[PDB]
Design a protein around this nucleic acid. Structure first.
Ligand code: 4BW
Ligand code: MG
Length: 92
RNA sequence: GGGCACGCACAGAGCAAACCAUUCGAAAGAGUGGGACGCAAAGCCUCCGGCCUAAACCAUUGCACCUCGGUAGGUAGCGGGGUUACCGAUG
């Protein structure tokens, strides 16, 4: 089920938080405007990220194009987030 | 680690449609060389089904109008099955 937020994993856990945020942005921006990028590095949130897109269409094109895309020597696995981000919920 | 499955990849490799040249073949087809349409077994095997050939050999003087003898050879890149094998996001 499509969503404003794409959930990304199989990411490289050795990339610092800010750098990962930046690059994630820098190549997910082409698909539309990015509300936020929530990244981290704790134990269960390790190696993974949420890119929050302003409208859904942008998240679908993103997932479609860069599924399996190898990123910092690892192939990104992209699904839709199961839940709306607090940002998006908060707008409504 | 092995062995079973799986193909959305990832990371190394492989094969080769059409066309042309050439060889084998009655033919359909096959080999070799060039060459890439695609292929997760498009590696290998006719056991089953399909489709293609049908010259020579044997049977057959037979009244059809849906087609219909044996025999033989093909297609594994038409399936099913059998058998060998790489990768790992996975039951
Ligand atoms: N090593 C491996 N990789 C696999 C396998 N199955 C799937 N994959 C991966 O999924 C890709 C696509 O599989 P496919 O069955 O749809 O298309 C395959 C298939 O159609 C074909 N192909 C490539 N190598 C092949 C081969 N050796 N045998 C048969 N088909 C092959 O081209 C695609 C393979 O490209 P690929 O190597 O970049 O990517 C595979 C590969 O990364 C597999 O059984 N082994
Ligand atoms: Mg060749």
């Amino acid at each position: 089920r499509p969503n404003h937020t794409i959930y990304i994993n199989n990411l490289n856990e050795k990339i610092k938080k800010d750098e990962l945020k930046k690059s994630l942005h820098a190549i997910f921006s082409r698909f539309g405007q990015i509300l936020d990028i929530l990244v981290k590095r704790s134990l269960k949130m390790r190696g993974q990220a949420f890119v929050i897109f302003k409208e859904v269409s942008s998240a679908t094109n993103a997932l479609r194009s860069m599924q399996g895309f190898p990123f910092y020597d690892k192939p990104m696995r992209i699904q839709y987030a199961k839940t709306d981000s607090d940002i998006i919920a908060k707008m409504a």
